[PDB]
Amino acid sequence: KTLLEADPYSKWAILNVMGKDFPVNEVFTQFLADNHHQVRMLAAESINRLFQDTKLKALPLKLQQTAFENAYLKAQEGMREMETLDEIYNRKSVLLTLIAVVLSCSPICEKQALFALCKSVKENGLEPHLVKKVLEKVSETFGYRRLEDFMASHLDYLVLEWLNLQDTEYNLSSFPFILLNYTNIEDFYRSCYKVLIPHLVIRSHFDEVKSIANQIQEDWKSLLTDCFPKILVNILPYFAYEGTRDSGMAQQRETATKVYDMLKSENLLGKQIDHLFISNLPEIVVELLMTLHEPDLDPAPNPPHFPSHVIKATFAYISNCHKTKLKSILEILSKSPDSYQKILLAICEQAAETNNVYKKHRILKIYHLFVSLLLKDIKSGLGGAWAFVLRDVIYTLIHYINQRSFSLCCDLLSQVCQTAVTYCKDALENHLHVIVGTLIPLVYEQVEVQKQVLDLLKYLVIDNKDNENLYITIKLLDPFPDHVVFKDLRITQQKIKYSRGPFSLLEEINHFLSVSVYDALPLTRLEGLKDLRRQLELHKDQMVDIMRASQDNPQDGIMVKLVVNLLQLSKMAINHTGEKEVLEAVGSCLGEVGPIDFSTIAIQHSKDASYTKALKLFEDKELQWTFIMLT
Fold first, then answer.
1. Residues paired with residue 17 on neighbouring β-strands, in sequence order
2. Which of 29, 217, 296, 443 is the most buried (most CB within 10 A)?
3. Selection from 375, 469, 398 nearest residue 430 by Cα
4. Which helix (H) or strand (E) is 111 found in, with range?
């Protein structure tokens, strides 16, 4: 164990005996089947060294899998090398400890270890109570609230690997359903038919699904209709990726072809296949998205996993095979504009419900693929949904940035802003200020993060400063006095800001009020507030004559307007993250000016003119109610 700590990779940890060299890992695994019992538990506890670096870094996939299979075969040999019940139970407990530690310390080999455990439950005859207990221990070790939730996250791989062993004793009825909390196989069917049926659909077990359905008090037609998207996302992709490239990879295409042909039969769903396909378009694209895998150093996803190019070809083939024979899936997806909506609601919900960082990384690279698919067919747009989808994706990206992968998120934001400023002139005219003002406090981060932030800032302030529509947006934004390294930004910020000359105190206050009414997020304004403080500190002498000019109309005081604007911003920010900084900033800003008698008693709350005029032009109470509710 000590030398495994020293040299996990075994670069020089090779021991030579009788002229033959042996790796230390094989020697360590050899002690698993020692005659003395006490060696077994210690070896099971210390085998953690072969699945992680312990210098929390992981290990290469090949080494981890070969160590796992070596440990499994050694445990099997120790089982089969056999009063007796005592050491039989001891060997079973040692095997369970091995299969539990490999689950705990090796997230890469989760699925394979769980499949080995479920096979060994019936093969080795493991005690049900002990294995169940270690299952719930793992469940609340990882963080899952219920053990059934942990079971549901990998049951598809379990059943698929069980059925891919082509064994007579390994059938659906022989699946170890006792492991889950369901009392009887009927409850297991009721709970997991949506997964069990699609696995056997590709295997042409229609008699099996009929025999399950007629005994489950449910119609087989409805059950197959419910599982129709999941079998679509299985058979349909096989027709696209490198058709007839090689026989080994073309046998799947051939069996998919025959399955699709027999599903086109009159008795089967072939009569209404087109109607069901049109009915739920998001339900199949979500499954086409979640099946993405790039073979770096990530846990193995669900057994159906395809690379990015396979997904691209699948969408291309689905678009081509349509009766109208379009070129892109997004064109027929534009027939129902809501399809783009709830899919954005779909991919998000699985990301927030999970807490694993690796699963989050997988779902965010899937989201990268989806946004790339969105942006490669933006020439004609997504109908009238393009503005909504770009706003949704940019706000989701800024939320994922604010919750702290990160480089990939920066790639998404860069790509979407590039597309918006290239193929449009007003896409980023309003929802850009928060993005610009959000990544600045991220400068004090890793070198890659800082480099990406600086690159995005210089792209926004150099390559987009010539846009006529974006001139107002770039002119109206908060300064960045944070670090010296932003001098370039400074020498491209004061030019536009001070194009007409040096702004006075009144001009600075007017600009601050305009940017405050322009943006609804008080946090991103923090730096600007700091400048406002300087504007209150250096230019105190200018607060007299201005108030001399406001005596005629005291009810429109500039200073009181600034005070009430800061008060409104504080009221908005009182229930937001990072409140201790924005509250301190606004308090310091109000502390630069004393309680000057404004000769007013009433407080007027400024409101956007658009909302007031919309209310004014609505002559019906119902119309106003609908407008305010929708807003």
1. 20
2. 29
3. 469
4. helix 110-123
Spatial contact of 116 and 72, defined as CB atoms under 8 Å apart: yes
Q: Which helix (H) or strand (E) element contains residue 29? A: helix 24-30
d(CA 85, CA 585): 72
Structure tokens at 419: 């597309």
Reference 541, options 569, 568, 504, 516; nearest CA is: 504
- Which stretches within 432-524 are classed as H helix? 433-438, 447-458, 468-475, 487-491, 494-497, 505-518
DSSP state of 166: -
- Cα→Cα distances 8→28, 29, 50, 118, 620, Å: 12, 14, 7, 29, 75
How far is it, in rounded angstroms, from Cα 138 to Cα 131?
A: 11
Q: Of 322, 311, 321, 313, which is closest to residue 289 (Cα–Cα)?
A: 311
Stretch (H or E) spanning 21: strand 20-23
Who contacts 245 (Cβ-Cβ below 8 Å, separation ≥6)?
A: none
Burial 32-43 (b: 16+ CB within 10 A, else e): bbeeeeeebeeb
Cα 336 to Cα 282, 344, 352: the distances in Å are 10, 14, 26
Instruction: Please report, in angstroms and rounded to a whole number, the separation of the first and last CA atoms in the chain.
Output: 63
The amino acid sitting at 488 is: D
**Residue 306 to residue 196: CA distance in whole angstroms:** 21
Residues listed for the chain: 631
User: How many other β-carbons are positioned within 10 Å of the β-carbon of residue 185?
Assistant: 14
Q: Which H or E run includes 14?
A: strand 14-17
Angstrom distance (rounded) from CA 135 to CA 151: 9
Query: In angstroms, what is the resolution?
Result: 3.3
489 to each of 196, 446, 480, 528, 535, how far by Cα in Å? Answer: 58, 20, 8, 15, 20
Residues 6+ apart with CB under 8 A from 401: 409, 413, 438, 439, 442
CA distances (Å), 123 to each of 74, 95, 116, 337, 438, in order?
A: 15, 12, 10, 52, 56
The DSSP element (H or E) to which 142 belongs, if any, is helix 128-142
Q: 105: helix, coil or strand? A: helix
Q: How far apart are CA 435 and CA 433, in angstroms?
A: 5
Q: How far apart are CA 540 and CA 484, in angstroms?
A: 27
Q: CB count, 10 Å around CB of 291?
A: 21
Alpha-carbon torsion 184, 186, 192, 195, what sign?
positive
On whether the CB atoms of residues 604 and 564 are closer than 8 A, the answer is: yes
What determination technique applies here? cryo-EM
Q: What does residue 21 show for φ and ψ, rounded to 5 degrees?
A: -90, 145
**Integer angstrom CA distances of residue 508 from 412, 491, 512, 528, 529:** 35, 19, 6, 11, 11
The secondary element (H helix, E strand) that includes residue 17 is: strand 14-17
Please tell me the distance from the alpha carbon of residue 344 to that of residue 334, in angstroms, as a whole number: 14
Identify the three-state secondary structure at position 602: coil
Question: With contact defined as beta carbons under 8 Å apart, do 570 and 586 qualify?
Answer: yes
Residue with token string 């197959």 = 224
Can you tell me the distance from the alpha carbon of 596 to that of 559, in angstroms, rounded to the nearest whole number? 9
CB 383 within 8 A of CB 331: no
Which residues sit opposite 22 in a β-bridge? Answer: 15
Token duo for residue 524: 């991103």
Q: For residue 20, what are the β-bridge partners?
A: 17
- Residue in the block written with tokens 């056999």: 82
In sequence order, what are the residues at sequence separation of 6 or more whose Cβ sits closer than 8 angstroms to the Cβ of residue 620?
Answer: none
64 near 106, Cβ under 8 Å? yes
